[PDB]
Write an enzyme that holds these catalytic residues in place. Structure first.
Site, PDB file in Angstrom:
ATOM      1  N   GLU A 123      38.252  34.168  39.051  1.00 39.76           N
ATOM      2  CA  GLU A 123      37.543  34.346  40.310  1.00 39.76           C
ATOM      3  C   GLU A 123      36.062  34.772  40.149  1.00 39.76           C
ATOM      4  O   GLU A 123      35.226  34.482  41.007  1.00 39.76           O
ATOM      5  CB  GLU A 123      38.330  35.304  41.219  1.00 39.76           C
ATOM      6  CG  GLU A 123      39.819  34.904  41.451  1.00 39.76           C
ATOM      7  CD  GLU A 123      40.006  33.525  42.088  1.00 39.76           C
ATOM      8  OE1 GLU A 123      39.106  33.042  42.803  1.00 39.76           O
ATOM      9  OE2 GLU A 123      41.065  32.897  41.881  1.00 39.76           O
ATOM     10  N   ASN A 127      19.830  43.628  35.002  1.00 40.42           N
ATOM     11  CA  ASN A 127      19.745  45.011  34.548  1.00 40.42           C
ATOM     12  C   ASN A 127      20.978  45.524  33.850  1.00 40.42           C
ATOM     13  O   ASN A 127      22.095  45.351  34.338  1.00 40.42           O
ATOM     14  CB  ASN A 127      19.400  45.964  35.703  1.00 40.42           C
ATOM     15  CG  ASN A 127      20.480  46.017  36.768  1.00 40.42           C
ATOM     16  OD1 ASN A 127      20.784  44.945  37.341  1.00 40.42           O
ATOM     17  ND2 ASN A 127      20.986  47.216  37.033  1.00 40.42           N
TER      18      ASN A 127
HETATM   19  C1  LIG Z   1      40.711  30.412  44.159  1.00 42.26           C
HETATM   20  N1  LIG Z   1      42.146  30.187  44.108  1.00 42.26           N
HETATM   21  C2  LIG Z   1      42.601  29.361  43.154  1.00 42.26           C
HETATM   22  O1  LIG Z   1      41.850  28.742  42.397  1.00 42.26           O
HETATM   23  C3  LIG Z   1      44.123  29.118  43.103  1.00 42.26           C
HETATM   24  C4  LIG Z   1      45.074  29.890  44.018  1.00 42.26           C
HETATM   25  C5  LIG Z   1      46.430  29.213  43.970  1.00 42.26           C
HETATM   26  C6  LIG Z   1      47.408  29.673  43.093  1.00 42.26           C
HETATM   27  C7  LIG Z   1      48.652  29.024  43.022  1.00 42.26           C
HETATM   28  C8  LIG Z   1      48.909  27.916  43.830  1.00 42.26           C
HETATM   29  C9  LIG Z   1      47.932  27.456  44.706  1.00 42.26           C
HETATM   30  C10 LIG Z   1      46.690  28.104  44.775  1.00 42.26           C
HETATM   31  N2  LIG Z   1      44.578  29.291  41.736  1.00 42.26           N
HETATM   32  C11 LIG Z   1      44.469  30.447  41.051  1.00 42.26           C
HETATM   33  O2  LIG Z   1      44.204  31.524  41.605  1.00 42.26           O
HETATM   34  C12 LIG Z   1      45.083  30.315  39.640  1.00 42.26           C
HETATM   35  C13 LIG Z   1      46.614  30.449  39.898  1.00 42.26           C
HETATM   36  C14 LIG Z   1      47.240  31.863  40.027  1.00 42.26           C
HETATM   37  C15 LIG Z   1      48.699  31.464  39.731  1.00 42.26           C
HETATM   38  C16 LIG Z   1      46.967  33.029  39.057  1.00 42.26           C
HETATM   39  C17 LIG Z   1      44.227  30.894  38.459  1.00 42.26           C
HETATM   40  C18 LIG Z   1      44.795  30.333  37.141  1.00 42.26           C
HETATM   41  S1  LIG Z   1      43.566  29.836  35.906  1.00 42.26           S
HETATM   42  C19 LIG Z   1      44.406  29.812  34.385  1.00 42.26           C
HETATM   43  C20 LIG Z   1      44.136  30.685  33.325  1.00 42.26           C
HETATM   44  C21 LIG Z   1      45.021  30.406  32.190  1.00 42.26           C
HETATM   45  C22 LIG Z   1      45.886  29.346  32.490  1.00 42.26           C
HETATM   46  S2  LIG Z   1      45.680  28.684  34.061  1.00 42.26           S
HETATM   47  C23 LIG Z   1      44.054  32.445  38.293  1.00 42.26           C
HETATM   48  O3  LIG Z   1      44.664  33.125  37.534  1.00 42.26           O
HETATM   49  N3  LIG Z   1      43.085  32.906  39.104  1.00 42.26           N
HETATM   50  O4  LIG Z   1      42.688  33.887  39.222  1.00 42.26           O
HETATM   51 CA   LIG Z   2      22.875  44.568  38.736  1.00 44.69          CA
HETATM   52 ZN   LIG Z   3      40.341  28.844  41.180  1.00 40.97          ZN
END
Ligand SMILES: CNC(=O)[C@H](Cc1ccccc1)NC(=O)[C@H](CC(C)C)[C@H](CSc1cccs1)C(=O)NO
Ligand SMILES: [Ca+2]
Ligand SMILES: [Zn+2]
Ligand SMILES: CNC(=O)[C@H](Cc1ccccc1)NC(=O)[C@H](CC(C)C)[C@H](CSc1cccs1)C(=O)NO
Ligand SMILES: [Ca+2]
Ligand SMILES: [Zn+2]
Lengths: 202, 202
Positions: B143, B200
């Protein structure tokens, strides 16, 4: 991957044989070296080391030491000079020598192991062997790596599509990276020898 | 390609649901977050970004925004709170909300694209979904990657034996890395927006 921010103040010394080779043009030697420090930096990113060029000394007039074909012998002469001349004038962490002599048993570089921050041994010798600034960067990065306590990897060492920088021989490629072993040889060194000269932001 | 030294000042906000999950012990929550950031830092070594835990806000009494299942509703609500409340109290670069509510499409994270340093959109949502700090670290790093202009990688993206952090879904593993694409997305982000807040050292 717990590696704190370290900084290396590098001084590259180009010999007389290098001076002659680029048609005596200093701006040519400067640019090569600058690009090389750029590739080194990109390789050391994952290690959290930032390599900075404090001085580039070109022996435009005459060679300060007797540059020989025997790498270990030139390594010897360069250590005595670093200690008593260069370090007496310039405060620096590590010194690398850019020589254009055809090194003995087809050696393209040499540096002592686990010696970063030593008055005498914080050095390395790099041979000007390739017109490609990348293969020279991996070369100098290899030698700096030995200074940081990194031993070699296997000959079939690969990290993804990239070639491990600490391989024993040089194979041509376009992607080079440090191996997990190297990251470990350095983690232990930092905790073991605990180099004092590499903390200051230049 | 060499990327400059940048530093993100991160504030993690744990909601009442997170507070009620760890038996009202702030210390445990403090130790979970501290380790998650250490993991973020390790993933970011390659891109030259260091993340600092500037402040940890735990809503011990009550939530300051309406925490809803709809991830998007909660994102926009947390965005306006961060701009009028938090930013005017704590000078920071990015703010990640750690929520314990089960998000909509089985969502574990949500954050705006190419928005690092925005007073309102330099935010992100992270669901407390794994008791393993590593997966929690990839989720928050994924994120922060979006915040840095990074878009998703392929379904099965691999940089060697390591799983790409920017995959659209989390596959449980033991080593993670940012892919080349993610490294190019962030390069362009720096050149295009020139974010001042990430220069910074904290
Ligand atoms: C901005 N939101 C997104 O991009 C969506 C949200 C979502 C999740 C599941 C199904 C549909 C949508 N995916 C993520 O959040 C991901 C999914 C969740 C399961 C942790 C994303 C996975 S990356 C990877 C790192 C190593 C292997 S895969 C994550 O760990 N992120 O933090
Ligand atoms: Ca800063
Ligand atoms: Zn994402
Ligand atoms: C400290 N010296 C050494 O370890 C010996 C010297 C040597 C070479 C051949 C035969 C005997 C000795 N190896 C090297 O110098 C290497 C090879 C030379 C030929 C350019 C060495 C690493 S090559 C590679 C790095 C990544 C993928 S392949 C180099 O480019 N370093 O800077
Ligand atoms: Ca120093
Ligand atoms: Zn070697």
């Amino acid at each position: 991957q717990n590696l704190p921010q370290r900084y290396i103040e590098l001084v590259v010394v180009a010999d007389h044989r290098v001076f002659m080779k680029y048609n005596s043009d200093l701006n040519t030697i400067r640019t090569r070296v600058h690009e090389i420090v750029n590739f080194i930096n990109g390789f050391y990113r994952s290690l959290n080391i930032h390599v900075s060029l404090t001085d580039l000394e070109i022996w435009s007039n005459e060679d300060q030491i007797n540059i020989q074909s025997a790498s270990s012998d030139t390594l010897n002469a360069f250590a005595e000079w670093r200690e008593t001349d260069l370090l007496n004038r310039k405060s620096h962490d590590n010194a690398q020598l850019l020589t254009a002599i055809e090194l003995d048993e087809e050696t393209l570089g040499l540096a002592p192991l686990g010696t970063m921050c030593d008055p005498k041994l914080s050095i390395g010798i790099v041979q000007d062997h390739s017109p490609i600034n990348l293969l020279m960067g991996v070369t100098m990065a290899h030698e700096l790596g030995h200074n940081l306590g990194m031993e070699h990897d296997g000959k079939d060492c690969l990290r993804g599509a990239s070639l491990c920088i600490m391989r024993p021989g040089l194979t041509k490629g376009r992607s080079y990276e440090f191996s997990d072993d190297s990251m470990h040889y350095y983690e232990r060194f930092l905790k073991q020898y605990k180099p004092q000269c590499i903390l200051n932001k230049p």
